[PDB]
Write a sequence for this structure.
């Protein structure tokens, strides 16, 4: 019923059938009970459907090392669409489906269980979007300019780990921090790759990182335009504005790369002002 | 001495220009004699003389009255072209320093073609796609943005290349544009000029693609 309600079988009246399927999912889904709890058949059905949508992904490695993707991109798209249509179905019926809205111990764990599944769904969609973003770039190029531990972590990274384990999230945060670096070398567009990472895979990307990426953009593009005289004083001055904003949140690894570049461009006095500013914003109370 | 560094350098240049006329020599280019000092100052002044030279570098009628040259429609027309050529080239330098941090930096790697420069200019000034654009894209950028900033830089050829790769999408605009690039003085024939204006005025007076409106 859940599947039909989400449009499955419709690749073959159809609104009424899907509305009937919705009615069957609500009316006959059961309820949670004390036996440790026994969750409703409605919950197990949602878990069963979701699992079967990602069964080809879960235990599979993300990549195959000339690195490529284990799962074809076209398959990742359809899986994501199916997960999203399931999410859309739960949102449009948050008020009528038991357990979605907040509610005694039985209905409590029913709400917690259903909530956890929905958080996994959005994490699945974010994870898939991240993999698609990754292979839109030149991963082999990114994979080359990488440390061994992170190459090994990426070698045996599964979709399960990407979706549900901190190391996948931490590694994802490293890869995004690396792809933008490379994107700046190609230099097609920084602010487009920004809004790409900002929204779709939000909750895994950080807005303090994109402003940093915007700063490293002008820095590298100030090294690109380095031969020009009057164009840099606008690039380096605007890079400095971007750095000082995220001063209370710059990593020592980035702050160094910034100062290293400033010295190449004889921007001595400016680089000193950034480090002084980063200091005060890490310890405002002095 | 009551003369500042800049003023003094100009005086020396005006002494030369006088020494030349006092000894009957060739009348040298005064505008060049003044820009020689400008380079010793910030580019605020150099870019001025660049405009002065290009605005005065018009074919004149030697030994003709001043008022006559400036009233003649002949000369008044070339002024507009010399200015447009300055605004286009001036903007083209803005597009370089926007992509590369320094003019020198752009030169060492080589000034790219006006088309690839403009494309590498759209990447920055519009990173995300505006939802109101029309007529699709061309190699990853809206077709009308490319046409505008190419015309703005003054490379009509680069703009026409963009049109050639979107023949199906742009409709009848191809035969109209190809006439604009051919006809001199940046003007179309009254008949064809009438055909496009009425079309734009008909249902495109307010279009969601500003670049389309501009072109």
């Amino acid at each position: 019923a859940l599947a039909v309600a989400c449009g499955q079988g419709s690749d073959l009246m159809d609104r009424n059938t899907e509305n009937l399927a919705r009615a069957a999912f609500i009316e006959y889904g059961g309820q949670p009970r004390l036996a440790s709890v026994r969750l409703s058949s409605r919950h197990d059905a949602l878990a069963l459907y979701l699992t079967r949508l990602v069964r080809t992904l879960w235990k599979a490695k993300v990549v195959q090392v000339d690195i490529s993707s284990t799962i074809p991109t076209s398959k990742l798209v359809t899986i994501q669409e199916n997960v999203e249509r399931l999410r859309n179905f739960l949102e449009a019926n948050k008020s009528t489906i038991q357990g979605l809205a907040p509610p005694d111990i039985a209905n409590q764990k029913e709400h917690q269980a259903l909530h956890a599944l929905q958080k996994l769904m959005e994490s699945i969609s974010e994870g898939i979007s991240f993999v698609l973003m990754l292979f839109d770039e030149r991963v082999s190029d990114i994979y080359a300019r990488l440390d061994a531990v992170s190459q090994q972590q990426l070698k045996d990274l599964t979709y399960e780990q990407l979706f549900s384990q901190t190391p996948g999230k931490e590694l994802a945060k490293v890869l995004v921090k690396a792809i933008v670096n490379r994107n700046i070398a190609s230099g097609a567009n920084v602010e487009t790759v920004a809004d790409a990472l900002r929204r779709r895979c939000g909750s895994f990307c950080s807005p303090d990182d994109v402003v940093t990426f915007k700063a490293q953009e002008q820095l590298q593009r100030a090294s690109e335009q380095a031969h020009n005289s009057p164009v840099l004083r606008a690039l380096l001055a605007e890079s400095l504005r971007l750095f000082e904003q995220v001063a209370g949140s710059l990593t020592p690894a980035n702050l160094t790369t910034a100062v290293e570049q400033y010295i190449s461009l004889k921007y001595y006095a400016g680089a000193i002002q950034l480090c002084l500013t980063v200091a005060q914003q890490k310890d405002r109370g002095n | 001495s009551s003369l500042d560094n800049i003023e003094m350098a100009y005086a020396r240049q005006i002494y030369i220009y006088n020494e030349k006329i006092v000894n009957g020599h060739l009348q040298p280019n005064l505008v060049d004699l003044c820009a020689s000092v400008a380079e010793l100052d910030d580019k605020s002044i150099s870019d001025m003389w660049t405009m002065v030279k290009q605005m005065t570098d018009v074919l004149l009628t030697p030994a003709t009255d001043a008022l006559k040259n400036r009233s003649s429609v002949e000369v008044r027309m070339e002024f507009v072209r010399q200015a447009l050529a300055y605004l286009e080239q001036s903007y083209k330098n803005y597009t370089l320093v926007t992509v590369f941090g320094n003019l020198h930096q752009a030169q060492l790697g080589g000034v790219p073609g006006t088309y690839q420069l403009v494309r590498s200019f759209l990447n920055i000034k519009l990173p995300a796609p505006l939802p109101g654009l029309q007529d699709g894209e061309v190699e990853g950028h809206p077709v009308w943005a490319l046409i505008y900033y190419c015309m703005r830089c003054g490379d009509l050829l680069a703009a026409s290349q963009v049109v050639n790769r979107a023949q199906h999408q742009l409709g009848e605009f191809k035969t109209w544009f190809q006439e604009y690039m051919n006809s001199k003085d940046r003007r179309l024939s009254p008949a064809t000029e009438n055909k496009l204006r009425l079309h734009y005025r008909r249902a495109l007076r307010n279009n969601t693609d500003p670049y389309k409106r501009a072109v």
Notes: The interface with chain B takes residues 187-196, 221-232, 234-236 of chain A (CB under 8 Å). The beta strands of chain A are 33-34, 37-38, 63-64, 68-69.
